[PDB]
């Protein structure tokens, strides 16, 4: 009998039951997408895209629907937050039902191709043996692929006949679905330019049409058919796997670093925006600009939108999570309710002090305050006996500007320290911990989970490439070397060329 | 709803365990 690890090889020379297996796989994937969106809609709260965006609630396919322009629900809400809308049929709910109906119609077709496996189409009309002309098949499919890729970019993304795609300003504040015009210039190869994504599909769409056309009309060369075993469907699986892991590495990277197709209002921010203090630079540019323009400190920080300050907080850093800290970010620090205000620390001399922020590497971090010059002036000491920088000795105080706490100063050292303990995380928010019984421990975002999973699969698929590729080039010995191999073929100096018997001296 | 959370495992094995028994008996029949 076959061993368990080989049961699916019955399909190798059975094109119809291969098609039936492939249809069933396709049914389960579309079924999954349907199911996953239904569970997301049943648990998504859309009442606050400012402090409870989808990416904090551990939404995974929602952002992919919104990326291509499905933005609202039959219930009347949209993710951009407007109410009163009617998305027509292609709502989240409608997309989910499509994929479910699709899944059902694929199921049935698979039953049909399984029972009627013996189609004459699959027979080589010369020999009557099952056979597939893989080179012409690649041409046909490569041509289909080029048409869809051209049409995707020519019509859907432009908005010529479709919605476009999610675009935002650089600080993820004003996202929406919008038509995009192609960027044909060299800045379209810049991953942060969305017009390049349009150019790419239009241009590469035509290259596919032309190559598909070449690959239908022109036969593979003899040298290459033999080298790559093009009579062997398993060479296609070998190369196919290699292409898929190529692509899986790519999508993992652009997710982690960020590109125009992984916007931060759908997936959360990156770890790099915390590394470089990206949102903090901008937040501070605005306050200095309110202040040269002569607004009070209270006024300048009250002007900062909460959506921007929420980005400037390490609990939304994807690199602060854990492999078994499950669920949504909200399960950890809680549901963000309100920006508290920007904390300003002054020692007793009235110097402004700056909490050293925690880097992403560190599960725990100490509390150190410094001046504009970088000089340590206060801290929370561990050993108390010889401590000189304690909040009590240095009379540190905290005053808040903007937010829920704007205009309030605290002096009692235990309160002051407690906000010092939060300042290391960046800007300071109030959270709802009871509603989900939050345990207080940072989870990672969908940016985190998608990157992790696709990097792991990509690597695993490299071994698949290797395996099935080996099995293509060596199929003649899969079951074992030749029992009548003579030690002359294998011992040294016998053949001028290794393994070539025609070169005996 | 504030339901019994051991109800899931109870329903789950209620289905799986006797279900598994019958599949085992059917397959080893088909193969003789």
């Amino acid at each position: 009998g076959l061993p368990w690890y080989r049961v699916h090889t019955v399909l190798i020379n059975d094109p119809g039951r291969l098609i039936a297996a492939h249809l069933m796989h396709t049914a389960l994937v579309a079924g999954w997408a349907g199911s996953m969106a239904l569970y997301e809609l049943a648990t998504f709260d859309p009442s606050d895209p400012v402090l409870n965006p989808m990416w904090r609630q551990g939404m995974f396919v929602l952002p992919f629907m919104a990326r291509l322009g499905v933005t609202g629900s039959w219930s009347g809400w949209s993710i951009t937050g407007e109410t009163g809308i009617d998305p027509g049929f292609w709502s989240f709910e409608g997309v989910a039902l499509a994929h479910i109906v699709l899944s059902g119609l694929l199921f049935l077709a698979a039953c049909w191709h399984w029972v009627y496996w013996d189609l004459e189409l699959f027979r080589d009309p010369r020999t009557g043996e099952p056979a597939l002309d893989l080179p012409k098949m690649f041409g046909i499919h490569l041509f289909l692929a080029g048409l869809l890729c051209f049409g995707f970019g020519a019509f859907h993304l432009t908005g010529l006949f479709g919605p476009g795609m999610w675009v935002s300003d650089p600080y993820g504040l004003t996202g929406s679905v919008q038509p995009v015009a192609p960027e044909w210039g060299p800045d379209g190869f810049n991953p942060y330019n969305p017009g390049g994504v349009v150019a790419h599909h239009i241009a590469a769409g035509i290259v596919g049409i032309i190559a598909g056309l070449f690959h239908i009309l022109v036969r593979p060369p003899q040298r290459l058919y033999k080298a790559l075993r093009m009579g062997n469907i398993e060479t296609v699986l070998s190369s196919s796997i290699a292409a898929v892991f190529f692509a899986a590495f790519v999508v993992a990277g652009t997710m982690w670093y960020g590109s125009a197709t992984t916007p931060i209002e759908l997936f959360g921010p990156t770890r790099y925006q915390w590394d470089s203090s990206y949102f903090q630079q901008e937040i501070n540019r605005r306050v200095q600009a309110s202040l040269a323009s002569g607004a009070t400190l209270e006024e300048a920080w009250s002007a900062i939108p909460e959506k921007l300050a929420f980005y400037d907080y390490i609990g939304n850093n994807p690199a602060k999570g854990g492999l078994f800290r499950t669920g949504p970010m909200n399960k950890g620090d809680g549901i963000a309710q309100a920006w508290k205000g920007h904390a300003v620390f002054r020692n007793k001399e009235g110097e402004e002090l700056f909490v050293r922020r925690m880097p992403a590497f560190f599960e725990s971090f100490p509390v150190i305050l410094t001046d504009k010059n970088g000089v340590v002036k206060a801290d929370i000491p561990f050993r108390r006996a010889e401590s000189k920088y304690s909040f009590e000795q240095q009379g540190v105080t905290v005053s808040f500007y903007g937010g829920e706490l704007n205009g309030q100063t605290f002096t009692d050292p235990p309160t002051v320290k407690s906000y010092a303990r939060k300042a290391i995380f960046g800007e300071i928010f109030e959270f709802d911990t009871e509603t989900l019984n939050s345990d207080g421990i940072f989870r990672t975002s969908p940016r985190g989970w998608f990157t992790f999973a696709h990097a792991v699969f990509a690597l695993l698929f490299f071994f698949g490439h290797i395996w099935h590729g080996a099995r293509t080039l060596f199929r003649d010995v899969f079951s074992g070397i030749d029992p009548e191999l003579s030690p002359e073929q294998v011992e040294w100096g016998f053949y001028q060329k290794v393994g070539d018997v025609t070169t005996r001296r | 709803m504030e339901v019994n959370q051991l109800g899931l495992i109870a329903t789950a094995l209620f289905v799986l365990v006797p279900s598994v028994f019958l599949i085992i008996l059917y397959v080893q029949t088909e193969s003789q």
Partner: peptide, 30 residues
């Protein structure tokens, strides 16, 4: 999780129906 469990079990019943009808032991006449 309770809604899911109910719909899952109902869905398996409908799948059972399909194999019970179309993949029955076919009756034969001796």
């Amino acid at each position: 999780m309770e809604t899911i469990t109910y719909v899952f079990i109902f869905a398996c019943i409908i799948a059972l129906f399909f194999f019970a009808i179309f993949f029955r032991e076919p009756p034969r006449i001796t």
